[PDB]
């Protein structure tokens, strides 16, 4: 493989142009996430309250306690 080695023509060069290969080559994160913990603490409480009533007052009661009782 003429891999960029050798002569174009070994013709007037005094050599046979034979090539070879060199054999001897070788802190808000927790506080922002508490408000994230608090986040579903309001929705999912108001959701699980919505499962047992969507009167928007009985769920606001379960959500209000879950917001105050958790933040305590």
């Amino acid at each position: 493989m003429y891999n960029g080695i050798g002569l174009p023509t070994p013709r007037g060069s005094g050599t046979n142009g034979y090539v070879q290969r060199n054999l001897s080559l070788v802190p808000d994160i927790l506080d922002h996430e508490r408000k994230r913990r608090v986040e579903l603490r309001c929705l999912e409480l108001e959701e699980m309250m919505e499962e047992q009533g969507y009167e928007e007052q009985q769920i606001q009661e379960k959500v209000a306690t879950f917001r105050l009782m958790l933040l305590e």
Binding site: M1, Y2, N3
Partner: protein
């Protein structure tokens, strides 16, 4: 055969290449135009017969 006819470039800037496999003449003859600057009087050979 005897050669047909007979400075700086940027693409061969040796800091700006990635060399994973050395290009070798068999590739340079498989795809004459992709792998070669100034390919002239070259016949484009391919076959998967």
């Amino acid at each position: 055969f005897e050669p047909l006819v007979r400075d700086w470039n940027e693409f061969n800037d040796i800091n700006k290449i990635i060399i994973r496999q050395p290009i070798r003449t068999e590739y340079k003859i498989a795809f004459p135009y992709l792998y070669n600057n100034l390919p002239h009087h070259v016949h484009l050979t391919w076959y998967h017969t």
